[PDB]
Swiss-Prot record, chain A:
The gene is bioA. The lineage of its organism: Bacteria, Bacillati, Actinomycetota, Actinomycetes, Mycobacteriales. This is Adenosylmethionine-8-amino-7-oxononanoate aminotransferase. It comes from Mycobacterium tuberculosis (strain CDC 1551 / Oshkosh). Signal peptide: none annotated. The record marks 18 as: Participates in the substrate recognition with KAPA and in a stacking interaction with the adenine ring of SAM. Its EC number is 2.6.1.62.
Swiss-Prot record, chain B:
The modification N6-(pyridoxal phosphate)lysine is found at residue 277. Belongs to the class-III pyridoxal-phosphate-dependent aminotransferase family. BioA subfamily. The keyword Transferase applies. This is Adenosylmethionine-8-amino-7-oxononanoate aminotransferase. The gene is bioA. It comes from Mycobacterium tuberculosis (strain CDC 1551 / Oshkosh). GO terms for biological process: biotin biosynthetic process. It comes from the Bacteria. Substrate binds at residues 58, 151, 277, 310, 394.
Length: 425, 427
């Protein structure tokens, strides 16, 4: 198919994310390193993938180590059913994940998507308390501003009013919501969180939050000390603590996992997105040995979940390579350099008339605007400057590949600033 | 690098397996070290042995493992574009696959929403159904109806329409959505069943967004078959009472039942359809939800607006590329004759099990063969028996069954069925 034919087929037959049908996408034809080749007005152009393809492509596209890991595994074994069989890619990846995640997370359940890994975490929490003979502990608690995926359970802990799933609240499980967690640390907030949790403790299976950075809900940051408070509160009231690190994992916030900013270990943890270096869909839910054993010794005797492509050897093999590539370099210095480049590059946006905030956390850079960003203006403005940016809500933001040179980061931040300037034009 | 012993050690300490425990699995998993064609290489007592993948790795591996055409499609795409976000961008693999799927699926399904697994595609189908009726100003139409014996995945909405026994709905009391269940659809066609289904649906019609069923073959819920004519009845009932019809063809798709899609046995088109498992030829996780023009434009014209779903790895170029190759490989051969031959081989091979003491039924539909026994099948006994005969079988409950790769030779089908018959004999 030509780009023209792709556009025609796409218009007729393809549903895009968070969209309606019939009420235009840009053709992508190649991706290498930090760069995409897109078709604009019939001609190929090279643009920086400032979004890392929705936060996945941390080593960029077509990395030789990841490519070879995939082709090596493809030669041996593409996939076998994980029911009754095991294999080396799953074992290598599970061993890696247990060793690099917060202390105490000793078991690994692979699934094929982030939303599913969140449902698995919830199922773990619910089955845990059923195993303890306390089936009334079945509700979830979170704070506002959150996002945890698009399946119906995950939707139930999305922000009820400003969240993308707000229109569904009347058919979702009704969960417990604390107010928006502030950026700066305020002990009054933690005290109020505890007071609210206290009156629901007997019906709460778990607290579920995104640690440090809330992503799709508004790119909001909060002080890591809140996580210390959450761990304490959950410990004292016997509520499981679940961290959704599907966006924050694998170095993105400047720590390997955002939980590490607070030295906190949850009872259950979800990871995904950057897990495979953006090659293939894979996610994982980890839990402590205590949780696993309590589920396993329960009247159920088994965690009742088992995706068809569970622990897919191809996805596991590229994930192993991606994690090893990350760990085998000085990733912390790399991220610190990125963060410094984002900070320096976005500083001039603070003075722009339409800009209300500029904030950076590791390899996350955000310009918050005073109005929703119009993609019809933003997209060509960024493409004109050789950068693929995808704003949402009132945010112009970047989550660049870790392989971006300082010059490339400067190019990215320059485009972001010019998009923000156009917002107030 | 890891030896098989080190793999077992890591696995026992750190890996969850499907529907299992940590620490008290009666049987340790077996180490798989290679797969090629219809054959797996497994480690038995330290020795690598080649055994037939009689299960097609849970319905997925219809062209066998490491098929050259599929390997090639994957590596070709890998060299140009591994993955880009589907938010704001599109690409040739997505377009090629979408075009293929709309052309070969039942008439009227012309829009495709890609996702990353079967369970998610079922959730997307339910969301479509619910949002559809919201778009018609009937938000009370929010429940689902199905018949017993079904399986539709493991996420919480998918669980709510799984058979209340199979999905152990006593453990999840009040947790799951309360859906409407009709009785187990029988194997043989009985118009009384359909009339009863209709009467039950009628009393719930103002509450119901959709009927969701597996057409012709109910897989994980019990490998049960039913007459295609029931689907004709469902289509009619749904039309007259204004309830959408959703077919979950995640297990039945791409030729498995002897038709390209099981719906084709009845010549009916659902409003929404889910596909998966064999979509990628068993290389990578991919699924899709298709709907009619009416469904898509009613959702899109609703005040609610956009369908708020968007998997991060939606329409992944690698998975789409291999799927295109898998579908073209299927369509480029006389697949109908291939399946008919497989069915003949299964029927011939399983015939002798019918007289076995423990066996209550033997049934075959396309490339699916089932021996139903009168008691649960012991894995600790059945697995070495099968392996001794060069076959990887995975019984569940009282069922010894197989869904072999379409590339299996007559000799391989003879080997598989003989292994099944022997497992039944040992029961
Ligand atoms: C296997 C299956 C599913 C779920 O697919 P996963 O990829 O395991 O989530 C759903 N419906 C049917 C009919 C299936 O056979
Ligand atoms: C991306 C993401 C998920 C899962 O989304 P998918 O669309 O299923 O990949 C869940 N939680 C958070 C915090 C995420 O960023
Ligand atoms: N479901 C995966 C994602 N969903 C979103 C939503 C808004 C911004 C980024 C993302 S990534």
């Amino acid at each position: 198919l030509t780009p023209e034919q792709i556009i025609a087929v796409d218009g007729a037959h393809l549903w895009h994310p968070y969209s309606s049908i019939g009420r235009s996408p840009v053709v992508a034809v190649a991706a290498h390193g930090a760069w995409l080749t897109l078709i604009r007005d019939g001609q190929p152009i090279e643009v920086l993938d400032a979004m890392s393809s929705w936060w996945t492509a941390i080593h960029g596209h077509g990395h030789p180590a990841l490519d070879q890991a995939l082709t090596t595994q493809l030669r041996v074994m593409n996939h076998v059913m994980f029911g009754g069989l095991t294999h080396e890619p799953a074992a290598r990846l599970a061993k890696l994940l247990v060793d690099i995640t917060p202390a105490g997370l000793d078991t690994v359940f692979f699934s094929d998507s982030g939303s599913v890994s969140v449902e698995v975490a919830a199922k773990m929490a619910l089955q845990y308390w059923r195993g303890r003979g306390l089936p009334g502990k079945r509700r979830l608690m979170t704070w506002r501003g959150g996002y945890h995926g698009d399946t119906f359970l995950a939707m139930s802990i999305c922000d009820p009013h400003g969240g993308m799933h707000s229109l569904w609240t009347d058919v979702l499980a009704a969960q417990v919501f604390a107010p928006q967690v502030p950026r700066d640390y305020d002990p009054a907030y933690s005290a109020a969180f505890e007071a609210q949790l206290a009156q629901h403790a007997g019906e709460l299976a778990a607290v579920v939050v995104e640690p440090v950075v809330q992503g799709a809900g508004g790119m909001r940051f909060h002080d890591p000390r809140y996580l210390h408070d959450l761990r304490d509160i959950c410990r004292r009231y016997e509520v499981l603590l679940i961290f959704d690190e599907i966006a924050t994992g694998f170095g993105r916030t400047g720590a390997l996992f955002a939980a590490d900013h607070a030295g906190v270990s949850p009872d259950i943890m979800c990871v995904g997105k950057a897990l495979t270096g953006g090659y293939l869909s894979l996610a994982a839910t980890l839990c402590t040995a205590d949780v696993a054993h309590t589920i396993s010794a329960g009247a159920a005797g088994a965690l009742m979940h088992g995706p068809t492509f569970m622990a897919n050897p191809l996805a596991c093999a590229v994930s192993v390579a991606s994690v090893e590539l990350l760990l085998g370099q000085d990733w912390r210095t790399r991220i610190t350099e990125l963060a410094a480049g984002l900070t320096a590059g976005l500083d001039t946006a603070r003075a722009l008339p339409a800009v209300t905030d500029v904030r950076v956390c590791g390899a996350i850079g955000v310009i918050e605007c005073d109005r929703p960003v119009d993609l019809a203006v933003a997209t060509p403005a960024a493409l004109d400057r050789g950068v693929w940016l995808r704003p949402f809500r009132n945010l112009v933001y970047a989550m660049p590949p870790y392989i971006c040179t300082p010059a490339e980061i400067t190019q990215i931040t320059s485009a972001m600033v010019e998009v923000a300037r156009l917002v107030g034009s």
